[PDB]
Symmetry: C2
Subunit: 102 residues, 2 copies
């Protein structure tokens, strides 16, 4: 059936997670390790990715299916999908859990 | 244009638009201007307006929220509260030409 989203209080976030998770799973990009505890749930939109935290490359197959904004790039951060401004590493959108184990 | 001011809205439009294009669900007419101004988050759908059914093949790919359902309104994909006809989310221009 369809995924029961409960209350429609963040419908666009639900849609965004669902397609990112479909991409990750169907491309074999699951099982990524989460960020260290203390860092994990604490990325902040409008601030740079914390120092010493890896941002890994998202494959072209997946980047073809996510929106493209000149001057920004989608990255894997822990098990999350994160759009980051090039150069400043300013976190711009965060979709959590996309690359978690299945 | 081309800036990430509303990234989740852009993702949601792309998902909806692609489902529609992939099913050939296109060439619905937008609402004319004097009706369009009354389609708004939190307002009841104006009566008079056709609400069309989203085809199973597509609706099966959209989130489900108990007590609400997706309809086609003009060329928009719209989540509506069933008990009140209150417009709860709008994805604009999904079913355009």
């Amino acid at each position: 059936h369809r995924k029961n989203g409960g209350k429609p209080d963040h419908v666009e976030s639900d849609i965004s997670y669902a397609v990112a998770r479909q991409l990750a799973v169907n491309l074999g990009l699951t099982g990524y390790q989460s960020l260290p505890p203390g860092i994990a749930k604490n990325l902040a939109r409008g601030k740079p990715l914390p120092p010493g935290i890896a941002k890994k490359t998202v494959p072209a197959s997946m980047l073809g299916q996510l929106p493209y904004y000149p001057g920004y790039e989608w990255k894997i951060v822990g098990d999350n999908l994160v759009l980051i401004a090039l150069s400043t590493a300013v976190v711009t959108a965060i979709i959590n859990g996309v690359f978690d184990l299945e």
